[PDB]
């Protein structure tokens, strides 16, 4: 009877820092997923402040099968483009901003592609 998957992430966020801080931007993702074999992907994109948007990081759980038991069981690769710093963190669901300059301020989006479908995405405006 069940078919598909559902996610929930509280789209709109607002984080304010100051130069030289060590904050960590974290999302609290909620999910209920069936049909175990999927391709989860958690992608952090960035836009300075607006139409264009850069790419900052992306974690991929490729061909995982842990459906309802905590998906951190199976681990995936977390290759991040080094044009930024931004030490990535657990499950790929949170960034860590180490020794931040002002230039990192901007609108960050965290889009979750589940099996090629954008199942949720949340905005967070980081500014001084």
């Amino acid at each position, epitope marked *: 009877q069940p078919r598909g998957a559902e996610f929930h992430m*509280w789209n709109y966020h607002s984080h304010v820092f100051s130069v030289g801080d060590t904050f*960590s931007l974290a999302m609290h993702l909620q999910y209920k997923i069936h049909e175990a074999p999927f391709d989860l992907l958690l992608e952090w994109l960035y836009v300075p402040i607006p139409h264009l948007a850069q790419r900052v990081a992306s974690t991929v759980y490729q061909n995982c099968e842990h459906a309802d038991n905590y998906t951190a069981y199976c681990l995936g690769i977390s290759h991040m483009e080094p044009s930024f710093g931004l030490i990535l963190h657990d499950g790929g669901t949170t960034l860590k901003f180490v020794d931040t300059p002002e230039s990192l301020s901007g609108l960050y989006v965290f889009v979750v592609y589940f099996n090629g479908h954008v199942e949720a995405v949340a905005y967070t405006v980081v500014s001084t």
Partner: antibody, heavy 121, light 108 residues
Framework: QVQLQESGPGLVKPSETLSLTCIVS????????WSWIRQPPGRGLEWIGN???????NYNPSLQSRVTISLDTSKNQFSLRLTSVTAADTAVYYC???????????????WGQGTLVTVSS | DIQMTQSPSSLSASVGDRVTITCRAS??????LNWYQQKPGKAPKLLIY???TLQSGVPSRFSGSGSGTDFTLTITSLQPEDFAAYYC?????????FGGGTKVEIKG
């Protein structure tokens, strides 16, 4: 089992800053959202904002231009700041918790006592 | 801003009667709303979460149901202790928004 207490002044002159502070006890700031809700003297209640354990504040955009929420994990508390208070901001202010770990669970389960903030001169 | 419409806004029922209130949303909020009860002078208590689940320590005469954009709270047998007001609140999308509220007065 956790309990929360508001510590704000009950009278604020118009156009000034309303500053409240909610102290939590009997529990942690661990992984929940910590929220503020207003209720006018006879009207229904409206959500003003909540804050996570690493900044990441969610504000009601109706008055996002005037409000800020700060965290004091070191002292296990969190404060609400509302600038340029008009006569319409007279309401009862509750501090509460939004939590739950499941799909359909994001409830305001544990509420505070609520303090009355009347604004006049 | 999701608009939440609550029905009715004021009702009077005798003791033991079956009370039913409806909550409607402008957008589909998947099993995402909570029913709260506010007694006069006191702070709201969580009655129902997940739109169908009972909070610990609440009598079983409170029953939540519905999904999509239509939800229903049912008090099976009214008691003289349930004079409070009742609200339905969504948590699907920021900003979180409450309902108008229903004044349940006891006519028994």
């Amino acid at each position: 089992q956790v309990q929360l207490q508001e510590s704000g002044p009950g009278l604020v002159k118009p156009s000034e800053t309303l500053s409240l502070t909610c102290i939590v006890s009997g529990g942690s700031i661990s992984r929940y959202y910590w929220s503020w809700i207003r209720q006018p003297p006879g009207r229904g209640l409206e959500w003003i904002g909540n804050i996570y354990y690493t900044g990441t504040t969610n504000y009601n955009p109706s008055l996002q231009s005037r409000v800020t929420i700060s965290l004091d994990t070191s002292k296990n508390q969190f404060s609400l700041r509302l600038t340029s208070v008009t006569a319409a901001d007279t309401a009862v202010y509750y501090c509460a918790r939004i939590g739950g770990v499941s799909f359909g669970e994001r409830p305001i389960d544990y509420w505070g006592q609520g303090t009355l903030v009347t604004v006049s001169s | 801003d999701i608009q939440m419409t609550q029905s009715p806004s004021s009702l009077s029922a005798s003791v033991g009667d079956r009370v039913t209130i409806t909550c409607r949303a402008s957008q589909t909020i998947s099993t995402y709303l909570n029913w709260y009860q506010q007694k006069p002078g006191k702070a709201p208590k969580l009655l129902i979460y997940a739109a169908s689940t009972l909070q610990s320590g609440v009598p079983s005469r409170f029953s939540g149901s519905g999904s999509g954009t239509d939800f229903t709270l049912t008090i099976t047998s009214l008691q003289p202790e349930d004079f409070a007001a009742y609200y339905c609140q969504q948590s699907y999308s920021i900003p979180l928004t409450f309902g108008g509220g229903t004044k349940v007065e006891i006519k028994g």
